[PDB]
Amino acid sequence: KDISLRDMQISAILKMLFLNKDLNNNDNITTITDDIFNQQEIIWKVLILDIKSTATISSVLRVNDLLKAGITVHSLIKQDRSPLPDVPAIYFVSPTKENIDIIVNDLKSDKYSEFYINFTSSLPRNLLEDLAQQVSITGKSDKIKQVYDQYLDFIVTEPELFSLEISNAYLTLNDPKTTEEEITGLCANIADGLFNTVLTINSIPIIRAAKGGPAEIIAEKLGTKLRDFVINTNSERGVLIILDRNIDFASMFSHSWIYQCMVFDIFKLSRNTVTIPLATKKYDIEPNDFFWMENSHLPFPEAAENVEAALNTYKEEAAEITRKTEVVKKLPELTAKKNTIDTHMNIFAALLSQLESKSLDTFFEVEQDPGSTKTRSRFLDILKDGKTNNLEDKLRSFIVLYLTSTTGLPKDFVQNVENYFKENDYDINALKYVYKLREFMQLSNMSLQNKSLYGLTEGKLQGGVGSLISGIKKLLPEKKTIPITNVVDAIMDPLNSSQKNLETTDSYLYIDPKITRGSHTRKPKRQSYNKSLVFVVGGGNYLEYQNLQEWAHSQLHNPKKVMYGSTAITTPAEFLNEISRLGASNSS
């Protein structure tokens, strides 16, 4: 019974839908039993969200969960909302002049019997006074039962994956154009996002961050924020590791065999909403998706298998019940269960379709060797069997190679391969900037030490293959740790870490908000940690998330919880743009 980051946000969100009940008193349960809900006897309320806040709720809660919490209706602050003078209202909206104004307008209008103002991040005195002044001249200040800064300004995608939804950060931060002001402002927001997360965790962590770039600024910014918070209170432990995306670009482009990553990669998977290919079917991977929370971290083959094991144990399970016996269905539990299966059932199917229709298992190998012509060839060799549904992956696997190379990479490829694109005409504005990032991928890979360790589908129920699962199962390489996992490893478990990883993270800015100045320095000290919050400033991936979890979920002798997150969870594709935009801008 261990709580995930998402469970903690869902709990905070739920506590708010209960008029921030149970607050100011006792109780340690987590997801209210119904017999207790009947203890306070709850009444229906209106729930007003705004664009940004809806994105936060719809990520962790389903409509059924809302009703179950007493929410009758939910609508955006900006819509024309029909009055409900005798019903309570809970606003969960962004701290903006715009919204505040509307709360004041609805307050006057008498749209609802009461108001429970809940701000997404934190309302500034600036606006508190504003809202106050306006409300003062109303004879209704009495109807506002409570105003709360909820500090839930982030989205929790998977159980331990979070995003500040601050898109295009790597660009904004490294674009020469960008002001020395725009940068400070950006950092300040990221610092807030983190802070918002940290408070949700209810743990004041030790901040550790790579020096020199953004990550440091943000670290020192968040250090100061957390420091005051500890002060303005009175007058093991956790760690928060803040890294620069510069630590490992190869991973932003790489290819993977684990279920999530593929789905995230090949089927733009956002907000628990897979999008399978103008043609576009949409499957919802609703949190607590019986299968998904069981085969996400699993390699395509096992997953594909485990699906047919479930569709098999479903056909059985349903046969025993077939003996006794938005639409009220005869058996919801069963229908719902089969339907989750029906989802993955063809995600795998549509996946294979995508695998073969562009022979993907190739790129994956071209990147598992970064070395001699053994691999060198296999690449031009692959771009020799020309297509089009490879074009993107081509550029990617190339970049991976150019970056992980561990040795020059002949002026030949750069020319021959570069040609293959400028002739097939697929702007390579990116390969301009990419070549620079190589010196980074090389310095941290050298500074670290990697440790290791449709009917057709209903078809593959053998425990073996379908003549395609065979190749992928054999092509299962060394799921060795990645650069990020190394840095986290050395920080969370010092005693059992390579000297290289320890020494490299040893150079990481160390800061404790509970102390004041520190000493002459904030002389880095090694400690072990149970939980950690890991934030990459400039880009997040399922690839790194996947790694970090496998690493954490394999720690026997002092288990670890790792919460990963970035300014935005960017897609190999999307990140590939950000880069090229810098190659475009970094010349004119």
């Binding site: 921030n20 508190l128 002044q133 709360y148 209810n202 209170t233």
Partner: peptide, 26 residues
């Protein structure tokens, strides 16, 4: 932070006490 967050989160009183000062002035 440490169950001290509940403190930083609730701003009702702070608010009301402002509504109040704004009433006394206007």
């Amino acid at each position: 932070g440490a169950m001290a967050g509940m403190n930083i989160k609730d701003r009702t009183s702070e608010f009301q006490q402002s509504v109040l000062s704004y009433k006394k002035r206007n």
